[PDB]
């Protein structure tokens, strides 16, 4: 929905864009008239990542402080991060959202199992000719005019940001922290273009406009280099503190190293350590290492780490090798007739002017009970330094010579590009839980959804909609992802209630069923088969179904693998999906064998052969129950396609106490690997690995 006209500045941005066909414009003032005017997370990801559009958000229409805060809060809640800028461009970078906040149209004129929120922030600061203009002379600065000492100078950087939670896990003395984590990185796999000052260093020669005997008489001003590059990380309040950084110690000159900066987080665990999957309560069960790769080639520069306080850290690439104009001289004395450039610019590494790509890793922590918000500020700068050298004449009696000198008091100019983003500590990703939904199984595609007034309804499932996602916490409460202060309460199931210690807010799954029970009363969660309204029931009846299905959602990070459908038994069989994009299966009363190639089937020898086409599959449903021969057993897999067609392998006829698990494939995702558990008779479980 577009309701308001574009601002004058937005019209300039749209018209000046290099690819205007890929533009998508949104005036944030529209949200006051229509809550659905803003794109949902699914729509924004589809536009930005799948369709490769450039989405422009416009906050410039109304400058009211109350309105500014409301629109920013809506943006922050929906997309995970907030900015205090009039405009925000959103584009795709490394499969994630890249935010480019800016103020003026001139700034953009081209002429696994760990739950975490990932995005990128880009800064692009062209440096004007005036900003690299210095006097042509230092000895005679008022006489020789001025010139630009750089050419097409530019700062272009991309910051990787991760919002995540670490739980405490591990042996005493080596346990992971229990803290909310904001991680900011400039790494090898997502870096921007870097900082550029010049393709090659030129110079200009000048002489004294007066006769000289014992005086400076000649000067050379060389194109500028970076005396330093600096990167400062700050916060708006003390809710966050620096926990870990790389660099940790100062780096020396001529340092060549690719550093793996690993950070250990405690997690609720994947399918390997948590058998119950989506039905598992929040509990630390494993630790994972999240690594960022940082390549250093410091050459002329040492890297100095400075921590002003617990909230601030800075990294400065400081010139150490050939750091002075004097050090660049390759001549010391000469006869007076000699007239030549006394400087060897080959002593200046190209990292100093041609291309510099900084790398660093900053990990902030906040307490596990932190609330409110914090702004994170990054100041990236280059200290532009022109180079001046001079020649001094010496006459004694009957001989003479000149000596060469460097000047270090000459002017410098620091150009800084700043960026700031806002983090909500109440974001559900900071609970450490993997988001899940509550699907009303009597319906085909209905999930529990919370509206703005916290009322509960049944809506078409959208696994990227926060209103349909919950966190199954350590007490068995179902905490809403839209508001972590609200919980699903059996005392009143028409509206979410403030989370507390009451037993009516705690839920327990009945093993090997689709039945979710309330702790206080022992009754089961039921839903009306027509309206979807929730209630507590001691049994099913004509109007009410007691079947609830839960699965992992994609509100934080898109799931790259399904949970284990069925059960694990024996050796896991990894099978890659071939170019046919087809599954081969021998079926009967159950699934005898399953495979990706007609010859390569894992399982038993019986059953009737058939094939399943993976093209257009929207979801996969696994049916299990007590088999005619044995206990709990996977007996059927149902593939549902986007057109609505369904194909089922196996059967449900020879089973009792049937229950289902549903795995929904994300859009534009390809199945590439199958993990199949089977004995000599039947297939026991299957897990799907995806690529996005």
Numbering used by the authors: 0 to 110, 133 to 713
From the manuscript:
Vibrio α-hemolysins (αHLs) are β-pore-forming toxins secreted by Vibrio pathogens, crucial for the facilitation of bacterial infections through host cell lysis. These toxins are produced as inactive precursors, requiring proteolytic maturation and membrane association for activation within host tissues. Here, we investigate Vibrio campbellii αHL (VcαHL), and establish that its hemolytic activity is significantly stimulated by calcium ions, with an EC50 that aligns with physiological calcium concentrations. Using X-ray crystallography and cryo-electron microscopy, we decipher both the immature and assembled structures of VcαHL and elucidate the conformational changes corresponding to toxin assembly.
